[PDB]
Amino acid sequence: TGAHERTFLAVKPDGVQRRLVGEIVRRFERKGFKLVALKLVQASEELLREHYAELRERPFYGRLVKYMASGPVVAMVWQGLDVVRTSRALIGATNPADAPPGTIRGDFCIEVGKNLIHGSDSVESARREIALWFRADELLCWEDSAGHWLYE
Amino acid sequence: TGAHERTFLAVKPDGVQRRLVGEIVRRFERKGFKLVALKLVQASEELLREHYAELRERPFYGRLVKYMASGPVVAMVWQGLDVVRTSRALIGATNPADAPPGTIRGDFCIEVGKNLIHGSDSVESARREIALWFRADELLCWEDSAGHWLYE
Amino acid sequence: TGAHERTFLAVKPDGVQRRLVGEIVRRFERKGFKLVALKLVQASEELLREHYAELRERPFYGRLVKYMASGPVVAMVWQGLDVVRTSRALIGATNPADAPPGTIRGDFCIEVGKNLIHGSDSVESARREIALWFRADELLCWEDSAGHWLYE
Amino acid sequence: TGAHERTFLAVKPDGVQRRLVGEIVRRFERKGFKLVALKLVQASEELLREHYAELRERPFYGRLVKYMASGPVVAMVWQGLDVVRTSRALIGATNPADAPPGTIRGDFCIEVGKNLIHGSDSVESARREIALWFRADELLCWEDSAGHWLYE
Amino acid sequence: TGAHERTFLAVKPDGVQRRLVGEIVRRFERKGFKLVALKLVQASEELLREHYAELRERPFYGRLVKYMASGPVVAMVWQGLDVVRTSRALIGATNPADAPPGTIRGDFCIEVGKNLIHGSDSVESARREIALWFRADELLCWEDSAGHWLYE
Amino acid sequence: TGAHERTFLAVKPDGVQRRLVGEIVRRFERKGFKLVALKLVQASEELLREHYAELRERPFYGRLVKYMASGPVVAMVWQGLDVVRTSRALIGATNPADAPPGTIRGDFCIEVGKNLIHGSDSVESARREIALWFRADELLCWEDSAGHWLYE
Ligand SMILES: O=c1ccn([C@@H]2O[C@H](COP(=O)(O)OP(=O)(O)O)[C@@H](O)[C@H]2O)c(=O)[nH]1
Ligand SMILES: O=c1ccn([C@@H]2O[C@H](COP(=O)(O)OP(=O)(O)O)[C@@H](O)[C@H]2O)c(=O)[nH]1
Ligand SMILES: O=c1ccn([C@@H]2O[C@H](COP(=O)(O)OP(=O)(O)O)[C@@H](O)[C@H]2O)c(=O)[nH]1
Ligand SMILES: O=c1ccn([C@@H]2O[C@H](COP(=O)(O)OP(=O)(O)O)[C@@H](O)[C@H]2O)c(=O)[nH]1
Ligand SMILES: O=c1ccn([C@@H]2O[C@H](COP(=O)(O)OP(=O)(O)O)[C@@H](O)[C@H]2O)c(=O)[nH]1
Ligand SMILES: O=c1ccn([C@@H]2O[C@H](COP(=O)(O)OP(=O)(O)O)[C@@H](O)[C@H]2O)c(=O)[nH]1
Ligand SMILES: [Mg+2]
Ligand SMILES: [Mg+2]
Ligand SMILES: [Mg+2]
Ligand SMILES: [Mg+2]
Ligand SMILES: [Mg+2]
Ligand SMILES: [Mg+2]
C-alpha cells in the first residue's frame, strides 16, 4: 500500500531482559516509521508454532519455539514506505556475526539464537504475522503530523 | 508489596507524535524498573473520564479528556521499589516550567497541557488506574535477571 | 509576546573548541524551542564591550571580553514560552560548581570562566542582545509543525 | 588544500522541522571536522536555481527548488582532509533506501525528496557552492586545538 | 592542589554486571575531569574492610564488604578543580531515592545497596583511598590538551 | 575456547585526549562482550617495539612507536565468541577513510595515524599481546549474569 505498507516486529525475550526495548523502538521512531500497534505479551507455544510454521523441519525449531515462549516479547506493527525491507536492513543479518555496526544486531548481539528481535521477511509474511498476533481493533489509524516531513 | 509496587504510566498523544516513546521507555529501563505491561491504545472518553474522575470539578477536565482521546497513547505498567514516587520524580513537575533539566518534562516540554506523559500520583491511584486500563492477563510476571543487581 | 518570547544564546569559544555545538543545539531542539537565527561569527571587542556593558566595573570584564573575542562563537536566537527563564535553567548556574547534573554546565563544565555558553538574563537583555548581534532579516519566521504538540 | 579541503552542507527544511540540526552537527563534530561557517537562512529561488543548475533538466527540479525555498535551511562549511568524500559517506546515498544504518539518511530518512541534507559532490562543486552561499568574511579561520589529535 | 585535586571512584560490581562502565566514565570525561588512573580489579575483603573502616559499627557493613568483594570493580582516579565535591554531585545521594534525575544514581539505580559507584566523600578520604587502591606509579601525569578550554 | 576467546584492545593517546574512552568501552559493553582486564598505562618504547614487531620494516614504524609511547593508553582485554574478528569489525578499517559510519573509526576519525584504537588481528596475535601487556593476575574471571541473554 506504498506508504501504508506494514511490518511485524517483535523484541525477543533477550531484548526485554537486556533492557533494549526503548532503544529498539527509538531506532524505528527516529527513522520516520509510524507505530500502529504495540503490546507486551507472553506468546503461547500454539501461536509460536504457527508463527514459525515455515521453520518446522529445521533442527532449531523446537528450541526456538520454547525460547520465544519462555518470557515476554514486545509485539509491534510499523507503517511506512518499504517498511518491511528497510526494517530488515535496520535490524541487520540473522546471524549477528554478519550484521555490520550501525544495525541493531551489529551493535547489540553476538549469537544467532540471541539476536534480540524478529522482523517479517516479506510483505506477505508481514500480512500473515500481523493477523496472527493482533486483532484488527489493535491496529490504530492516527493522523501522523510528522508525515509531511518524511514523504513528498 | 515493596519491590512489587506498580505504577501506571501513559505516553500522551504529544509523546507519540513527537516520537519520544522509545526515549521515555529507555529512561525507565535504564533506571532498573521492570516493564510488566505495555500497549498502544486509543482510549475512549468513557475510560478517560473515570481515569481523571478526581479532576471532574476542575475547568480543564473537559479539554484534558478530549485531548487524551484525540490520538493514540502508550499505556504501561512498571514495577519496582518506590516506583510510584520515583516515576513521578523522573517525569518531573506537572507544569514543565517547574520541572528541572534531567526530568522528562524538564528536558522535552514547555507547557502544562502538552507535558508528554501521565503517571499515577500514589499507590492507591496506581491500583485503580492499572485495573481500569489493563486486565490481569495483560500484566506479565517474568523472572528479571537484572533484579539481583538492582536489589539487595 | 507569550509563545513569541525570544532569547539570545551564544556558544562561547570553549564550546566550539570542545565540539559541543551540536550537543547544545540538540538540547534546545528537544525541549521544543524554535530556532529563529543562527550563525558562526568572530565577535569584535567593540561588540562584546557593549554586550557586557553591565559588567564593565567587574574585575573579570577585561578578560571576559578578550576571551570572547579570541575565537568563533555560535550566536543564536530561540523562541518559545518563557524561553529566557527556561534557557537559563537548562544552562545552569553561572558558576558550574553550582549547576546540577542535567544542566549544560552541570554536565560539561568545571570553571566559571569556561562555562560554554551565554544566555540573556531577562526579556529586556534579550531584546538588546538580539538587536545587537542580528539584523531583522536574519531572524526567520517559519511555520513550526511541532508547535501543535508543544502548545495548547 | 589537503587538510584545508572544504565542503558545503545544508540541513534542508525537513531537518529543521524534525529538530535534527544538532544531531547532524554533532556527527560532523565528533568525526573531527572543523566548522568554518554556519548560518540559518531562507534561500531565494534565484539562489537555489543556480545551486541546482546542473539538475535543471530533471523532473524533480521545480519541486526541489520550491521545497528548498519553502522554509529555513542551515548552511554550513566544514573543513578537513577528504571532507567532501567523507561527508558524502556520513550522509549516505541520495536515496535513503540505499543508505545503510549508521549514515544520516540510513538512520533518519525514508524518501529521496525528504533526505534531510545537501552535501557538495566534489571539491569543484564545493568551491562553487561555498562562494554562492557565503561571503569570504563569513568563513572563519580559527586555531583548532583538536587538530593535533586528528592529524599526524 | 586546586586543579590538581584528585578523587577515588569505583564502579561497583552491579555497574560492571549491568554494563554501565563506559556510561559512567563518559560522564566524567564529558564534564572535563582528567583520568589519571584506571584498572579492573577484584578487591579483597581485607582491603574493603579498611576502605570502609568508618562504617565498621554500622549494620550494613558486613554485607557491603561481602558485596564489594563479590565481583570485579573498576577503580579510578580523576583530577580537576573541586573534583571530590563535584564527583559526589554527579553521582547523587547515597540512597538513589533521594538522587535527582541527571545524576548517575538518579538515572540508573533504585536501592541503596545497589548504587553503582563509590566516590570519596572528602579530600582526606580521597588521599587515603587513592593510596590504598593504587601505587604512585599507577597515577599518570599527562599533558591535557583540553585543559586550556576547561580552566582560565 | 569458543565463548572464552579473548582479544587485546588499546585506546591510543588520541582516544584519551579526545575523551572517547567511555564511548569506546560502551560500544563493547553494549555488544555483549565481557571485560576481563583494564588499565591506564604509559607504555615504554621497548614494549611497543615488540607490540609492533611485525611492522619493523615499515616506514611508519618509528613514528608509530614514538606516538604510542607519547601519552597514556587504555589497555583492555575483552572476552566472547568471535571477539577478535568482531572487535575488528566494530573498530573499522585501519584507514578511517575506508571505515563506514557506525564503526568507531568511521564515526570518530579521519587519518590513519590518528585512528583511536588498536585491536589484535588474530587469536594468535591476541594471545601474544595479552601476555605482553598484562600479567596473568590482571585477567579476571567473573560470573557474567548477562551471558544467559547473549549465548544459547
Ligand atoms: O541456526 C539458526 C538459525 C536461525 N535461528 C533463529 O531463528 C530465527 C528465525 O529464523 P529465520 O531463518 O527466519 O531468520 P530471520 O528471518 O528471523 O532473520 C532467527 O532470527 C534466529 O534466532 C537459530 O536459532 N539458529
Ligand atoms: O491547569 C492545568 C493542570 C493540569 N492540566 C493537565 O492535566 C493533567 C493532570 O492534572 P493533575 O493535577 O492530575 O497533574 P499530574 O498528576 O499529571 O502531575 C496534567 O498532567 C496536565 O496535562 C492542564 O492541562 N492544566
Ligand atoms: O566571577 C565571575 C563571574 C562571571 N564570569 C563570566 O562572565 C560571564 C557573565 O557573567 P554574568 O554575571 O553575566 O553571568 P551569566 O549571566 O552568564 O550566568 C559568565 O557567564 C562567566 O563566563 C567570570 O569569568 N567570573
Ligand atoms: O529522483 C530524485 C533524485 C533526487 N532528488 C532530490 O534532489 C536532490 C539533489 O539531487 P542530486 O542527484 O544532486 O543528489 P545529492 O547530490 O543531494 O545526493 C537529492 O538530494 C534529493 O532530495 C529527488 O527528489 N528525486
Ligand atoms: O543503609 C545503608 C547505607 C549505606 N549503604 C551502602 O554503603 C555505601 C557507603 O555508605 P556511605 O555512608 O559511605 O555512603 P556514600 O559515601 O557511598 O554516599 C553506600 O554507598 C551504600 O552502597 C547500604 O547498603 N545501606
Ligand atoms: O600507512 C600506515 C598504516 C598503518 N599505520 C598505523 O599503524 C597501525 C598498525 O598498522 P596495521 O596495518 O597493523 O593496522 P591495524 O591492524 O591496527 O588496523 C595502524 O592502526 C595505524 O595507526 C600508519 O600510521 N600508517
Ligand atoms: Mg523469519
Ligand atoms: Mg494526574
Ligand atoms: Mg549575563
Ligand atoms: Mg546535489
Ligand atoms: Mg562513603
Ligand atoms: Mg595491527
Short mmCIF file of N, CA and C and ligand atoms in Angstrom, two decimals, chain B residues 152, chain E residues 12 52 55 58-60 63-64 67 88 91-95 105 111-121, ligand 5:
data_model
loop_
_atom_site.label_atom_id
_atom_site.label_comp_id
_atom_site.label_asym_id
_atom_site.label_seq_id
_atom_site.Cartn_x
_atom_site.Cartn_y
_atom_site.Cartn_z
N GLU B 152 19.07 -5.65 47.00
CA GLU B 152 19.88 -6.48 47.88
C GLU B 152 19.07 -7.74 48.18
N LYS E 12 31.04 -0.20 41.17
CA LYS E 12 30.78 -1.36 41.99
C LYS E 12 30.38 -2.54 41.10
N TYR E 52 36.27 0.83 54.14
CA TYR E 52 35.04 1.23 54.80
C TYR E 52 35.19 1.22 56.32
N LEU E 55 32.70 2.78 58.65
CA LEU E 55 31.36 2.22 58.67
C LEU E 55 31.31 0.92 59.47
N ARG E 58 28.35 -0.09 61.64
CA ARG E 58 27.03 0.04 61.03
C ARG E 58 26.50 -1.33 60.62
N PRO E 59 25.16 -1.52 60.60
CA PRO E 59 24.57 -2.85 60.39
C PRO E 59 24.74 -3.39 58.97
N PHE E 60 24.96 -2.51 57.99
CA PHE E 60 25.12 -2.92 56.59
C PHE E 60 26.60 -3.22 56.24
N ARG E 63 27.56 -6.79 54.90
CA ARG E 63 27.01 -7.12 53.59
C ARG E 63 27.65 -6.24 52.53
N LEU E 64 27.91 -4.97 52.88
CA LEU E 64 28.61 -4.09 51.96
C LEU E 64 30.00 -4.63 51.58
N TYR E 67 29.57 -7.82 49.46
CA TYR E 67 29.13 -7.49 48.12
C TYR E 67 30.28 -6.90 47.28
N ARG E 88 30.75 13.91 43.70
CA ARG E 88 29.68 13.44 44.55
C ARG E 88 28.36 13.98 44.01
N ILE E 91 27.33 11.93 40.98
CA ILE E 91 26.91 10.61 41.40
C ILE E 91 25.51 10.64 41.99
N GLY E 92 25.25 11.62 42.84
CA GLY E 92 23.97 11.76 43.52
C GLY E 92 23.98 11.15 44.92
N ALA E 93 22.89 11.38 45.65
CA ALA E 93 22.74 10.97 47.03
C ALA E 93 22.97 9.45 47.19
N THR E 94 23.44 9.07 48.38
CA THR E 94 23.75 7.68 48.72
C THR E 94 22.56 6.79 48.40
N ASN E 95 21.40 7.19 48.91
CA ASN E 95 20.17 6.50 48.61
C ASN E 95 19.61 7.02 47.28
N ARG E 105 23.00 8.03 40.00
CA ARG E 105 22.13 7.15 40.76
C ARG E 105 20.67 7.47 40.48
N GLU E 111 18.08 1.16 44.67
CA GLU E 111 18.22 0.84 46.07
C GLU E 111 19.64 1.15 46.55
N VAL E 112 19.74 1.48 47.84
CA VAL E 112 20.96 1.99 48.43
C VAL E 112 22.09 0.95 48.35
N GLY E 113 21.77 -0.35 48.43
CA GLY E 113 22.80 -1.38 48.42
C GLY E 113 23.27 -1.71 47.01
N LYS E 114 22.56 -1.20 46.00
CA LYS E 114 22.95 -1.39 44.61
C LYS E 114 22.98 -0.03 43.92
N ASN E 115 23.98 0.77 44.29
CA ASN E 115 24.01 2.17 43.90
C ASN E 115 25.24 2.51 43.06
N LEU E 116 25.78 1.47 42.40
CA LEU E 116 26.57 1.53 41.17
C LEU E 116 28.03 1.96 41.36
N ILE E 117 28.28 2.90 42.28
CA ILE E 117 29.55 3.59 42.27
C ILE E 117 29.88 4.06 43.68
N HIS E 118 31.18 4.08 43.99
CA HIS E 118 31.72 4.72 45.18
C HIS E 118 32.50 5.95 44.75
N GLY E 119 32.34 7.04 45.50
CA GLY E 119 33.21 8.20 45.36
C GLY E 119 33.66 8.69 46.73
N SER E 120 34.93 9.10 46.85
CA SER E 120 35.43 9.66 48.09
C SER E 120 34.51 10.77 48.56
N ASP E 121 34.36 10.93 49.87
CA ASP E 121 33.45 11.93 50.40
C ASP E 121 34.17 13.22 50.84
O1 LIG G 5 21.73 1.93 54.78
C1 LIG G 5 22.70 1.90 54.02
C2 LIG G 5 23.71 2.90 53.86
C3 LIG G 5 24.73 2.69 53.01
N1 LIG G 5 24.86 1.51 52.30
C4 LIG G 5 25.96 1.29 51.31
O2 LIG G 5 27.20 1.68 51.89
C5 LIG G 5 27.88 2.58 50.99
C6 LIG G 5 28.69 3.52 51.81
O3 LIG G 5 27.86 4.24 52.77
P1 LIG G 5 28.34 5.79 52.96
O4 LIG G 5 27.60 6.43 54.09
O5 LIG G 5 29.84 5.83 52.98
O6 LIG G 5 27.78 6.49 51.61
P2 LIG G 5 28.40 7.09 50.25
O7 LIG G 5 29.63 7.88 50.67
O8 LIG G 5 28.71 5.90 49.31
O9 LIG G 5 27.29 8.02 49.66
C7 LIG G 5 26.77 3.26 50.19
O10 LIG G 5 27.35 3.82 49.02
C8 LIG G 5 25.76 2.12 50.02
O11 LIG G 5 26.01 1.39 48.83
C9 LIG G 5 23.92 0.50 52.41
O12 LIG G 5 23.97 -0.56 51.78
N2 LIG G 5 22.89 0.76 53.27
#
